A paper describes a structure:
Recently, we identified and described a [name] ([name]) pathway in the brain, in which [name] acts as a removable memory constraint and metabolic buffer within neurons. [name] becomes overexpressed with age, and it is possibly a novel contributing factor to age-related metabolic stress and cognitive deficit. We therefore created highly specific [name] inhibitors (QR2is) to enable evaluation of chronic [name] inhibition as a means to reduce biological age–related metabolic stress and cognitive decline.
Purified human [name] (hQR2) was then cocrystalized in the presence of the water-soluble inhibitor. YB-537 was found to bind to each monomer of the hQR2 homodimer, forming interactions with amino acids from both monomers as well as with the Flavin-adenine dinucleotide (FAD) cofactor. The plane of YB-537 stacks up parallel to the isoalloxazine ring of the FAD cofactor with an average distance of 3.5 Å between the planes of the two. YB-537 binds to the catalytic site through a series of hydrophobic and hydrogen bonds with both FAD and amino acids from both [name] monomers. Specifically, YB-537 forms 6 contacts with G150, G151, and M155 and a hydrogen bond with N162 from one monomer (A-blue) and 8 contacts to F127, I129, F132, and F179 from the other monomer (B-red). Analysis of the SAR data revealed that the imidazo[1,2-a]pyridine heterocycles gave high activity of the sulfonamide and proved to be more potent compared with other heterocycles that were evaluated, forming crucial Pi-Pi interactions with the protein, attributing to its potency, as was later found in the resolved crystal structure. Specifically, while Asn162 in [name], which is His162 in QR1, provides a hydrogen bond to plant YB-537 within the catalytic site and over the FAD prosthetic group, several other residues found only in [name] also favorably interact electrostatically with the inhibitor. Further selectivity is likely caused by the 43aa C-terminus structure missing in [name], which, in QR1, may physically hinder YB-537 inclusion to the catalytic site, as would residues within the QR1 catalytic site itself, such as Y127 and Y129.
Residue numbers in the entry:
A (entry chain B), B (entry chain A): 2 to 230
Write the structure that this text describes.
């Protein structure tokens, strides 16, 4: 009954592997009757930089600019830039937020980092107190769907890149858990560039098939032991 | 001596703690006779988005855009955007790259993430087979000088945030080591916002004193065991 999904999507090319993973999610969730929204960050020319442009209205201290203080105040005063509040609107309504992106330097692309920096402000995504399990986005699900250049075998404890879960720590725990999300297990599509046509189609099909039962899943325990132990 | 240092600086406020840490490195390295350059990312309005605007002229394949391929070919063909090539010139000349930034979501601010995404391109910072110990920036040193909101206690293995080394893994290993940097021990100034006047000046003094002997330091073993063991 009216599950709402937000897909935050960070890829330049609609014919890319990320584009196909994004479209398959839109197709499959919509076929299920879910309500679906996509934030196509590149197509929006989404602003990634945390600057004083993000507050309209009088600054709590215009001689020494403190981004975290001013955007907290602006959030309560409703003087944040509208591109920020447009994203907060999509997030607040969502029951599940999916992040769809290629791994860039063991992390999200900078345009998606900027979305996190600027949308998840204090007052909206967390408060003091009110973080981790008491984060303000508690009750919501989050899911990282990431594609990588390296193979699965390279992302093992003994491979050169370390285990794949090591690079999920800042995103799943430092960010989503901190904000109160429960985190579903990541969807990692390893190395589509060198995968064969069969394997690429398989990776695409596993994502589609997993989405059919997405609402029946349990979140991971987002702990240091899950990531490192 | 005749050593060259590049500081890549990502803070909006000159009077900030990050700003003082940057000014102290300029003063201290300049006093020692070193050659100093600063990339003030916010002052430059540095572009964080990886887009087809990063290639000048016309594209290898304009109908399907692949950022990694196109920037690789653009670097070899000397047709990257000039803001990227300006930064690569400073890096190529530098014997040490210091990054000075507040921790944002267990990572770098998006404007600094964009620097990494766009400047450290294939053929410049790494290639096949040159990566990790044989990355193209071998011979150079790199150093993360990061400030946090959370205290040192919180960033322990059993505290709420986990070991601070957990979030250094994407930056130190996945990025800097991958490109061939030897990584100096991070400089972490924990929680200057809640620290007293005395501890804040002690944190600034530790940094200023460390810069007296920066060229004597041996790099860390940038391994998974250093980060998680
Ligand atoms: C700045 C930067 C930093 C990076 N850092 C890292 C890093 O730290 N670690 C790492 O591992 N990698 C890294 N990479 C590599 C990056 O993660 C991969 O290149 C990216 O994940 C690949 O997915 P894609 O959608 O871009 O590729 P695409 O090239 O778009 O997809 C690959 C092949 O996809 C086929 N495809 C598309 N749709 C379908 C379909 N429906 N069915 C079958 N085939 C299809 C494409 O047409 C093509 O055949 C980095 C890349 C860049 C640019
Ligand atoms: C978007 C966002 C995401 C964040 N994510 C995280 C996170 O994941 N984890 C985390 O721990 N924190 C996080 N933070 C908090 C952030 O890391 C800290 O607020 C930042 O590191 C503080 O350093 P600063 O330079 O901004 O502080 P400032 O406020 O500039 O410095 C603090 C106090 O510094 C005094 N000061 C300046 N110079 C001197 C001097 N020379 N001598 C003595 N005192 C001086 C200032 O005037 C002031 O009194 C986040 C913040 C934001 C905005
Ligand atoms: C471990 C790792 C880290 C970074 C990147 C990386 C960074 N990039 C920046 C711009 C463009 C590209 C294509 C890019 N790839 C790749 C791997 S990787 O796992 O895919 N790596 C394994 C060894 N051979 C090279 C490929
Ligand atoms: C672990 C963690 C993660 C994120 C942030 C964080 C995100 N932010 C977004 C906008 C503005 C601010 C000031 C901000 N802080 C802080 C901590 S933290 O370590 O500083 N944490 C310690 C316990 N009290 C709460 C703060
Ligand atoms: Zn967690
Ligand atoms: Zn390493």
């Amino acid at each position: 009954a009216g599950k709402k999904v937000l897909i935050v999507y960070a890829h330049q090319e609609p014919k890319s592997f990320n584009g196909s993973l994004k479209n398959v999610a839109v197709d499959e969730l919509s076929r299920q009757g879910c309500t679906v929204t996509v934030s196509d960050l590149y197509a929006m020319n989404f602003e990634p930089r945390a600057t004083d442009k993000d507050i309209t209205g009088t600054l709590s201290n215009p001689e020494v600019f403190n981004y975290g203080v001013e955007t907290h105040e602006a959030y309560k005063q409703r003087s944040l830039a509208s591109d920020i509040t447009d994203e907060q609107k999509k997030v607040r309504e969502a029951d599940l937020v999916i992040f769809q992106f290629p791994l860039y330097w063991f992390s999200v692309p900078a345009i998606l980092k900027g979305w996190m920096d600027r949308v998840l402000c204090q007052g909206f995504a967390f408060d003091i107190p009110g973080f981790y399990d008491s984060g303000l986005l508690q009750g919501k699900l989050a899911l990282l769907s990431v594609t990588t250049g390296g193979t699965a075998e390279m992302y093992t404890k003994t491979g050169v890149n370390g285990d794949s879960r090591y690079f999920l720590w800042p995103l799943q725990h430092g960010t989503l858990h901190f904000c109160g999300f429960k985190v579903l297990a990541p969807q990692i599509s390893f190395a589509p560039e060198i995968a064969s046509e069969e394997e690429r189609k398989g990776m695409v099909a596993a994502w589609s098939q997993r989405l059919q039962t997405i609402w029946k899943e349990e979140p991971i325990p987002c702990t240091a032991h899950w990531h490192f132990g």
